[PDB]
Amino acid sequence: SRQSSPQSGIGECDLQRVNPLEPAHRIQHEAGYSEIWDPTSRELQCAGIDATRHVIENRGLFVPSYNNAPMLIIVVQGHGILGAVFPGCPETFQSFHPTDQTFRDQHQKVHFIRQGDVIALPAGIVHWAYNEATEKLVLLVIHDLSNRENQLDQNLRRYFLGGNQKNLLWNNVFQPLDPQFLGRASGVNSEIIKKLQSENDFRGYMVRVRDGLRLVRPSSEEGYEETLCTVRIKENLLNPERADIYTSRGGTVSTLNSYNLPILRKLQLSANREYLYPNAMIVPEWNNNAHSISYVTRGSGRLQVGGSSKSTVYDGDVRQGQLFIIPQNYVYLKQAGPQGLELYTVKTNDRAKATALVGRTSVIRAVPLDVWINVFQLTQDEARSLKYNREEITVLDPEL
Amino acid sequence: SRQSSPQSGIGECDLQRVNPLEPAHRIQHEAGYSEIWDPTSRELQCAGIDATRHVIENRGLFVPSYNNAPMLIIVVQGHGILGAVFPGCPETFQSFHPTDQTFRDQHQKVHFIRQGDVIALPAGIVHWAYNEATEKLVLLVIHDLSNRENQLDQNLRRYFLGGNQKNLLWNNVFQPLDPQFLGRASGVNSEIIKKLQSENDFRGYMVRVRDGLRLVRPSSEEGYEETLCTVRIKENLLNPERADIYTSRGGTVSTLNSYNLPILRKLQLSANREYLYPNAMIVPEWNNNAHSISYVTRGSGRLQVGGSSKSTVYDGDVRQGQLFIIPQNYVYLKQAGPQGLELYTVKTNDRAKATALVGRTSVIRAVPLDVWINVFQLTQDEARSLKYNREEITVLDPE
Amino acid sequence: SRQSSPQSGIGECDLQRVNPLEPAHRIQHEAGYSEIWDPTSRELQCAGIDATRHVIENRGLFVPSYNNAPMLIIVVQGHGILGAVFPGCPETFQSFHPTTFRDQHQKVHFIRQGDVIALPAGIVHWAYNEATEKLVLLVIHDLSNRENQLDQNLRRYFLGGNQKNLLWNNVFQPLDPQFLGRASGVNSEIIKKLQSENDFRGYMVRVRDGLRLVRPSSEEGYEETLCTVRIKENLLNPERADIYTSRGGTVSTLNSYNLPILRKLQLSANREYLYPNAMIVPEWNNNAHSISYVTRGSGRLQVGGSSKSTVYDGDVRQGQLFIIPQNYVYLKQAGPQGLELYTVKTNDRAKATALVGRTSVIRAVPLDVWINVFQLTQDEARSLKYNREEITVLDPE
Amino acid sequence: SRQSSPQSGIGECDLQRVNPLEPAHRIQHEAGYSEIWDPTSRELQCAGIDATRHVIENRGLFVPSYNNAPMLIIVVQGHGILGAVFPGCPETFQSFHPTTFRDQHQKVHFIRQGDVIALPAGIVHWAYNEATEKLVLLVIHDLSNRENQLDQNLRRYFLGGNQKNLLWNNVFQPLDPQFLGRASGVNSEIIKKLQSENDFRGYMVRVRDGLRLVRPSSEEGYEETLCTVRIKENLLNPERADIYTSRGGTVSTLNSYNLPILRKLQLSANREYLYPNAMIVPEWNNNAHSISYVTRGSGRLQVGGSSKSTVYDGDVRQGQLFIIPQNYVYLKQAGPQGLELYTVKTNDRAKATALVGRTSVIRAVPLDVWINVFQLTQDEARSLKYNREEITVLDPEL
Amino acid sequence: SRQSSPQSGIGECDLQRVNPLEPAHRIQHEAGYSEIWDPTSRELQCAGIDATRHVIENRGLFVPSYNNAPMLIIVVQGHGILGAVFPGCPETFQSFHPTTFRDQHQKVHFIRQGDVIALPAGIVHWAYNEATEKLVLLVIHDLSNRENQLDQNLRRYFLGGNQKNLLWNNVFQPLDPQFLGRASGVNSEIIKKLQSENDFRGYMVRVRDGLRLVRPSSEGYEETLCTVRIKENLLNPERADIYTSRGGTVSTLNSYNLPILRKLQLSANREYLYPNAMIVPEWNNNAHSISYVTRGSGRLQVGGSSKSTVYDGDVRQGQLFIIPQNYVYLKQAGPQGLELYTVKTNDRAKATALVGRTSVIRAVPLDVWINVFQLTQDEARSLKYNREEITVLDPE
Ligand SMILES: O=C(O)Cc1c[nH]c2ccccc12
Ligand SMILES: O=C(O)Cc1c[nH]c2ccccc12
Q: B198 — alpha (psi -120 to 50), left (phi > 0) or beta? A: left
d(CA C88, nearest CA chain E) in Å: 4
The last residue of one of the domains, among C235, C264, C287, is C235
Taking an 8 Å cut-off on Cβ atoms, the answer to whether E390 and A217 are in contact is: no
How many Cβ atoms sit within 10 Å of the Cβ of residue E25? Answer: 12
User: Strand, helix or coil at B276?
Assistant: strand
The rounded distance, in Å, linking the Cα atoms of D246 and D242 is 13
The answer on C357 and C345 residing in a single domain is: yes
Find the E86 Cα to ligand 2 centroid distance in Å: 11
Q: Is the CB of E88 under 6 A from ligand 2?
A: yes
The rounded distance, in Å, linking the Cα atoms of A21 and D154 is 67
Rounded-to-5 percentages of helix, strand, coil across chain B: 15, 40, 45
Q: Which of B356, B388, B383, B350 is nearest to B369 (CA)?
A: B383
Q: Is the CB of C88 under 6 A from ligand 2?
A: yes
d(CA B295, nearest CA chain A) in Å: 19
d(CA E144, nearest CA chain D) in Å: 6
Angle at Cα E50 formed by Cα E44 and Cα E55, nearest 5°? 130
Q: How many residues does chain E have?
A: 396
Strand segments, DSSP code E, in E47-123 are: 49-56, 60-67, 71-77, 79-84, 93-95, 103-105, 108-112, 115-119
Are the C-beta atoms of D360 and D354 separated by less than 8 Å? yes
DSSP summary character for residue A204: B
D146 to chain E: nearest residue by CA? Answer: E286
User: Strand, helix or coil at B358?
Assistant: coil
The answer on E253 and E169 residing in a single domain is: no
Are the C-beta atoms of E331 and E289 separated by less than 8 Å? no
3-class SS letters over chain D: CCCCCCCCCCCCCCCCCCCCECCCEEEEECCEEEEECCCCCHHHHHHCEEEEEEEECCCEEEEEEEECCCEEEEEEECEEEEEECCCCCCCCEEECCCCCCCEEECCEEEEECCEEEEECCCCCEEEECCCCCCEEEEEEEECCCCCCCCCCCCEEEECCCECCCCEEEECCCCCCHHHHHHHHCCCHHHHHHHCCCCCCCECEEECCCCCCCCCCCCCCCHHHCHHHCCCEEECCCHHHCCEEECCCEEEEEECCCCCCHHHHHCCEEEEEEECCCCEEEEEEECCCCEEEEEEEEEEEEEEECCCCCCCEEEEEECCCEEEECCCCEEEEEEEEEEEEEEEEECCCCCCEEECCCCCCHHHHCCHHHHHHHHCCCHHHHHHHHHCCCCCCEECCCC
How many Cβ atoms sit within 10 Å of the Cβ of residue D220? Answer: 3
The rounded distance, in Å, linking the Cα atoms of E338 and E315 is 9
Dihedral angle, C-alpha A72, A73, A75, A79, nearest 10 °: -130
The rounded distance, in Å, linking the Cα atoms of D334 and B200 is 52
Exposure class string for C225-248: b at 16+ Cβ within 10 A, else e = eebebebbbbbbeeebbebbbeeb
Structure determined by: X-ray
Are the C-beta atoms of A306 and A15 separated by less than 8 Å? no
Cis peptide before E6 (omega within 30 of 0): no
The rounded distance, in Å, linking the Cα atoms of B359 and B336 is 18
Distances (CA, A) of E198 to E27, E163, E194: 18, 10, 11
Distances (CA, A) of B48 to B4, B13, B266, B267, C343: 11, 10, 18, 14, 31
Please count the residue pairs, one from chain B and one from chain D, whose beta carbons lie less than 8 angstroms apart.
Answer: 190
Cis peptide before D98 (omega within 30 of 0): yes
Of E92, E227, E249, the CB nearest to A259: E227
β-bridge partners, C280? C332, C393
The answer on A215 and A285 residing in a single domain is: no
DSSP summary character for residue C170: E
The last residue of one of the domains, among C209, C235, C261, is C235
DSSP summary character for residue E194: H
The rounded distance, in Å, linking the Cα atoms of B72 and B142 is 5
Report phi then psi at D177, rounded to 5. Answer: -60, -35
Residue bearing the CA closest to ligand 1, atom 1: D90
Are the C-beta atoms of A124 and B355 separated by less than 8 Å? yes
β-bridge partners, B157? B169
Find the D77 Cα to ligand 1 centroid distance in Å: 35
DSSP summary character for residue C266: T
What residues in A contact B333, CB-CB < 8 Å?
177, 181-182, 185
Closest-lying ligand to the alpha carbon of A362?
2
Taking an 8 Å cut-off on Cβ atoms, the answer to whether B5 and A3 are in contact is: yes
The answer on A198 and A248 residing in a single domain is: no
Taking an 8 Å cut-off on Cβ atoms, the answer to whether A366 and C106 are in contact is: yes
Are the C-beta atoms of C306 and C364 separated by less than 8 Å? no
- Identify the chains in contact with D, defined as 3+ C-beta pairs within 8 A: A, B, E
The rounded distance, in Å, linking the Cα atoms of A69 and A90 is 25
Are the C-beta atoms of B91 and B108 separated by less than 8 Å? yes
Q: B163 — alpha (psi -120 to 50), left (phi > 0) or beta? A: left
User: Strand, helix or coil at B397?
Assistant: coil
Q: Which residue type, as a one-letter code, is found at position D272?
A: E
Complete DSSP assignment for B13-55:
T--S----B--SEEEEETTEEEEE--TTSHHHHHHTEEEEEEE
The rounded distance, in Å, linking the Cα atoms of C44 and C49 is 6
Taking an 8 Å cut-off on Cβ atoms, the answer to whether E386 and D213 are in contact is: no
Close Cβ partners of A364 (under 8 Å, ≥ 6 residues apart): A357, A358, A372, A386, A387, C159
H or E element that contains E361 = helix E360-363
Q: Which of A210, A66, A77 is nearest to A125 (CA)?
A: A66
Taking an 8 Å cut-off on Cβ atoms, the answer to whether A6 and C2 are in contact is: no
Q: C58 — alpha (psi -120 to 50), left (phi > 0) or beta? A: beta
The last residue of one of the domains, among E234, E262, E294, is E234
- What CATH number does the domain containing A7 carry? 2.60.120.10
Find the D89 Cα to ligand 1 centroid distance in Å: 6
H or E element that contains E380 = helix E377-385
The answer on D363 and D274 residing in a single domain is: yes
What residues in C contact A313, CB-CB < 8 Å?
174
The answer on E144 and E22 residing in a single domain is: yes
Give me the number of domains chain B comprises. 2
Q: Is the dihedral of CA A194, A199, A203, A205 positive or negative?
A: positive
Are the C-beta atoms of A360 and A245 separated by less than 8 Å? no
Q: Which of D171, D185, A221 is nearest to E340 (CA)?
A: A221
Q: How far apart are the first and last CA of chain E?
A: 53
Are the C-beta atoms of A273 and A237 separated by less than 8 Å? yes
Contacts of the segment A208-213: beta carbons below 8 A, 24+ positions apart? A208/A30, A208/A31, A208/A57, A208/A59, A208/A60, A208/A61, A209/A59, A209/A60, A209/A61, A209/A130, A209/B370, A209/B374, A210/A59, A212/A59, A212/A132, A213/A59, A213/A61, A213/A81, A213/A130, A213/A132, A213/B368, A213/B370, A213/B371, A213/B374
Close Cβ partners of A193 (under 8 Å, ≥ 6 residues apart): A174, A179, A180, A182, A183, A186
Dihedral angle, C-alpha C296, C300, C304, C307, nearest 10 °: 130
Q: Is the dihedral of CA C359, C361, C364, C369 positive or negative?
A: negative
Exposure class string for A118-135: b at 16+ Cβ within 10 A, else e = bbbbbbbbbbbbbbbbee
The answer on D219 and D286 residing in a single domain is: no
Q: What is the atom index within ligand 2 of the atom nearest the CA of A393?
A: 11
Q: Which of C90, A258, A271 is nearest to E89 (CA)?
A: C90
The answer on E98 and E223 residing in a single domain is: yes
Distances (CA, A) of B227 to D6, D255, D273, D281: 30, 7, 18, 17
What residues in E contact C89, CB-CB < 8 Å?
220-221
User: Strand, helix or coil at E184?
Assistant: helix
Find the E103 Cα to ligand 2 centroid distance in Å: 14
What residues in E contact D199, CB-CB < 8 Å?
374
What residues in E contact A91, CB-CB < 8 Å?
390
Q: Supply the range of the domain harboring residue A351.
A: 238-400
Taking an 8 Å cut-off on Cβ atoms, the answer to whether E46 and D152 are in contact is: no
Q: Which of D267, D276, D262 is nearest to D395 (CA)?
A: D276
The answer on D52 and D173 residing in a single domain is: yes
The answer on D64 and D196 residing in a single domain is: yes
Angle at Cα B131 formed by Cα B126 and Cα B137, nearest 5°? 95
Close Cβ partners of E269 (under 8 Å, ≥ 6 residues apart): A226, E234, E250, E251, E252, E253, E341, E342, E344
The answer on A190 and A270 residing in a single domain is: no
Taking an 8 Å cut-off on Cβ atoms, the answer to whether A306 and C150 are in contact is: no
The rounded distance, in Å, linking the Cα atoms of A295 and B118 is 49
DSSP summary character for residue B218: P
β-bridge partners, C344? C269, C291
Q: Which of D317, D325, D319 is nearest to D300 (CA)?
A: D317
Exposure class string for D360-379: b at 16+ Cβ within 10 A, else e = bebeeeeeeebeeeeeeeee
The answer on C18 and C146 residing in a single domain is: yes
Cis peptide before A6 (omega within 30 of 0): no
Are the C-beta atoms of B354 and B288 separated by less than 8 Å? yes
Q: Which of A380, A348, A350, A384 is nearest to A365 (CA)?
A: A384
User: Are D and C touching by the rule of 3+ CB pairs within 8 Å?
Assistant: no
Report phi then psi at B249, rounded to 5. Answer: 70, 0
Q: Which residue type, as a one-letter code, is found at position B314?
A: Y
User: Strand, helix or coil at A71?
Assistant: strand
